[PDB]
Design goal:
metal ion binding (chain A), Transcription factor zinc-finger domain-containing protein (chain A), metal-binding (chain A), homodimer, 1 helix, alpha+beta, binds zinc ion, three-stranded antiparallel β-sheet
């Protein structure tokens, strides 16, 4: 389990656990590497955040008798 | 033509909402250049802003107090 080499700088990247997600940041250029399982944790929470926003808007529209077209951020991934 | 820090193989380029993400086709990890990470954070902020302004309007018309949730940027400030 050694450090990972930035693909730009060829220097060893810093690994930090933030909000429960392991991210690797190049100290020289600041690019970021996410292993697939860590990307998945980030996107699962983002999906929750978006769901709550859209359900809250869904209720306001439903009271008005207007349909709410679902948008977004998850659409990026 | 950037090498995966795991697999030492060429990563593929994927463009989403103007953000360029490098994806290893073997292990599936992702690389964001600092400039692309900046663009991702700006897009999350715009998506969040659109939700919060619509909700701010609904609460104002119902006369109920509202404080912004800032749900995306609370997650993405990890960068
Ligand atoms: Zn670097
Ligand atoms: Zn890989």
């Amino acid at each position: 389990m050694p450090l990972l080499l930035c693909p730009n700088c060829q220097v060893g990247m810093r690994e930090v656990e933030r909000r429960g997600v392991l991210i690797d940041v190049c100290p020289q250029c600041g690019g970021v590497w996410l292993d697939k399982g860590e990307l998945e944790k980030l996107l699962a929470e983002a999906e929750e955040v978006e769901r709550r926003y859209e359900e809250e808007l869904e209720g306001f529209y439903r009271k008005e008798g207007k349909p709410y077209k679902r948008k977004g951020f998850m659409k990026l991934f």
